Symmetry: C3
Subunit: 223 residues, 3 copies
């Protein structure tokens, strides 16, 4: 039926829209492949400055679609989250629905998270006997270690205001999509060279160790 | 009475109660040994999932009434155990936590704070650096608020503690916040909680020399002339 | 002509006043040298316990108008404000722009009055504020420091207090100082210096960061795009 992701080109921007609302926009190999290709297309256009991740229906992203790992290897979900943090593009998540489990990590790995009245964020992994090890670093770099780990242990649900007050969302309002035009106007005041250097410097100051992607991937598989 | 800790066994849980309300529940070698033994008892029971630290009277814990290379003081070893235990560790704070009493709560996975909860590091007023407690406070509040609160001997009520991350939950009474927290913890298991706490240590580690360095800094400032 | 810094001595304290209000208190080689000399003077006096950085007019500090391992003077000064045995206190009752934000953020305590504004404007000129960012992020956390940089976000006193950029906020930063000094009088220079040393033990900056941060600012000023964005401003 419909492809996992619909791509829309704009002025200096590429939008990837999660486009399976009837399945609650879950993460399958197809979604991860399509989002990577979309970021590749955006990065391959030297005039592109911004990558916008948005969605459809009641669910922004519901996490793994349930319908051995070599020493040193990492799973594709980890790789995609690291790319959203390391892209020369400004990455912007427009959250106007429920982000559940791996869907939280997907939003959190973006440079800016915009949350509307329908936004909800909840890591449900401990209820399935899992540690959300791949998502956690991307949440903890926003919320700090205590709120990320306590929210995991409690499967805490954040609405838009709660997400904004803990740093999981950068901006909050009635509708995330209506927050986007002023964000794009502001990003148009800088350039891709500058945004790239800024995100590379964030990795210099707040690095993730070389073994973490493997260790996080292995912990998710081991359980 | 003289017994620093009373142990209450429960359904999938062990409670350690600081049980010297008239002495204001001070930290002495006896309290630290009794808490370590209670955590040993809880961990040895394979059906135990939760360790609850609670107290009595106006004071949750008033702290202490005022080294070989590589060695760590028992206070350091106990706080590190509360962060690394396979049990979910829960502090129920319905009174004043002062000096080392702050670190004892802060080292727990979840801090519940009631209307009478207060948190204050008073060490700089005695010429001390609270070096052993600070890593467990900063892992909750972040570095700036931990260090600024230490320099200013800042007092936090339950609301202020909740806003800065020192408390995870706040309400009229910390003990009344416990039943829903335990119901929530029942949806996971000890295997998962242990793995989550081990991953927190993987992602946000304390280096292997820190317990010794922190222990030394407290001992060396008891000795400083300005301190007495 | 005009001295960038006016020094005022008090009991237990030395106050460095940025004293060029009609120039908006800009960062130049002279300001950085003068502040380093003031800090030397303050540290040399064994009865000095507090170094107070305060300013004049509408701007606290408007900001600015490599051999291997070398650090720029701005980096050296910010690091000194974090390593000084003195309690370092920024009194912000005006606009802190660009490098001005890092100068406040490197103090142990930031006091913000109603007129305080903090804004990293560097990305609008094609720059990364690499030397100030570690001193901002050690207060706000990485996400708010980097997002505020990407958006050139302006913080008022309330916003700065909520995110940890300011430790204290009130009507006037200058009037939050006497209660802060009364509190600091309950401890001593020995204890303050040991606490700041322990912050460096718990939350260190690696040995190459100052050089890497200094180099990134020099690289960005040389980017072809930088002159065109300055032209835009
Ligand atoms: Cl995960
Ligand atoms: Cl201590
Ligand atoms: Cl800078």
């Amino acid at each position: 039926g419909p492809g996992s992701v619909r791509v829309v080109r704009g002025r200096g921007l590429l939008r990837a829209v999660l486009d399976r609302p009837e399945r609650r926009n879950p993460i399958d190999a197809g979604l991860l492949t399509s989002l990577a290709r979309a970021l590749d297309q955006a990065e391959s256009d030297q005039d592109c400055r911004v990558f916008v991740l948005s969605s459809t229906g009641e669910d922004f992203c519901a996490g793994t679609d349930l319908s051995p790992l070599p020493d040193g290897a990492e799973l594709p979900y980890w790789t995609l989250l690291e790319r959203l943090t390391r892209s020369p593009l400004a990455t912007v998540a427009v959250v106007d629905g429920r982000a559940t489990a791996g869907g939280v990590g997907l939003a959190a790995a973006c440079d800016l998270v915009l949350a509307g009245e329908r936004a909800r964020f909840r890591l449900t992994e401990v209820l399935a006997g899992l540690v959300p090890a791949m998502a956690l670093p991307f949440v903890a770099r926003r919320t700090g270690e205590q709120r990320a780990f306590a929210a995991t242990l409690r499967a805490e649900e954040f609405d838009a205001g709660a997400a904004h007050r803990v740093g999981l969302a950068d901006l909050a309002g009635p509708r995330a999509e209506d927050l986007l035009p002023p964000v794009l106007a502001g990003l148009g005041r800088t350039d891709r060279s500058t945004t790239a250097a800024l995100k590379e410097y964030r990795a210099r100051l707040f690095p993730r160790d070389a073994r973490l992607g493997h260790d996080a991937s292995r912990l998710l598989i081991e359980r």
